[PDB]
Amino acid sequence: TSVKPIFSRDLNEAKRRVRELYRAWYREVPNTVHLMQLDITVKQGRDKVREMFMKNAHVTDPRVVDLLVIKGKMELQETIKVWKQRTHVMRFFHETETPRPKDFLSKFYMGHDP
């Protein structure tokens, strides 16, 4: 049914924005690692970026992709600037968190929660 567009009209039109963000992030990862004295490698980080831009790679409601960009850009602003410290950026890497197993037998074997 009809819906007002947030910023883009067709999913294709919007994707134009999604790519104009990917590029931005990609061209920024290198800078961050150095500026925030992060320890992860440029390649490693750039991987994360794709992962995320990829995680959201299934929605088709332009309005949603028009919205995730914005949220997305905002996250650059902060990261481009150093408004975010090392702690903030490094949180995208679950360094301490032990990744949860997924195998049923691997979960049944630990924790009553599914």
Partner: protein, 116 residues
Amino acid sequence: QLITVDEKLDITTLTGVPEEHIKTRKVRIFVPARNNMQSGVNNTKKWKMEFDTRERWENPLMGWASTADPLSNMVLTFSAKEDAIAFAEKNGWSYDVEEKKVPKPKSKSYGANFSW
């Protein structure tokens, strides 16, 4: 303007809910039932959407009840089945709607107990 889209408006990616709390979690739309202990029917009129019950364990030091289910104390209150199914679908949770159970009309008469 007025673009047209055909989704169930899944804002699952705008909500910000960790995947595992948007994937393996079942909301249960239902109109709360009456507290048999009282006869007030004002707490059985609005549809609630409560989530599944996960681990409630014991803090080793003081014996308090501890938990890791962030969405445990969550009881959203709607006003109709239609508006609850919509919210759950909107947020990407699985639902288990339970139809309302209004008492049927039972005819009561004072004299009846005097017949023989």
